[PDB]
Design a protein around this ligand. Structure first.
Ligand SMILES: CC(C)CCC[C@@H](C)[C@H]1CC[C@H]2[C@@H]3CC=C4C[C@@H](OC(=O)CCC(=O)O)CC[C@]4(C)[C@H]3CC[C@]12C
Ligand SMILES: CCCCCCCCCCCCCCCC
Length: 80
């Protein structure tokens, strides 16, 4: 399945990741600090669920494809 992981990251995947990043940044900029229970916060929290799911899916794909700290050139070998 590692070849599938390699091919998924190339199937226009960076653009989708960037779109998710931008939309989640706008979602962060749209929160209401003072009204902690207003419906806007309720919608943005669902948006945050979606963005968290997408990001953790990408992170798991990266773990599987590149491998953990066991060797250089893998996950945790970058601060990013
Ligand atoms: C090149 C990059 C840095 C562009 C940056 C643009 C956005 C990061 C910022 C600029 C001003 C922000 C907006 C300022 C406050 C509003 C109102 C906010 O809530 C409302 O619509 C008011 C109605 C209500 O409170 O119920 C929704 C998000 C929004 C559009 C924000 C969306 C994100 C915005 C567009
Ligand atoms: C994603 C960024 C855009 C969110 C738009 C605002 C959604 C919630 C506001 C409508 C309810 C009042």
């Amino acid at each position: 399945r590692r070849f599938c992981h390699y091919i998924v990251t190339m199937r226009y995947f960076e653009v989708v990741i960037l779109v998710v990043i931008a939309l989640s940044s706008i979602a962060l900029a749209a929160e209401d600090p003072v009204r902690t229970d207003s419906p806007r916060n309720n919608a943005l929290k669902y948006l945050d669920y979606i963005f968290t799911g997408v990001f953790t899916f990408e992170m798991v794909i990266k773990m599987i494809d590149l491998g953990l700290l066991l060797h250089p050139g893998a996950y945790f070998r970058d601060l990013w």
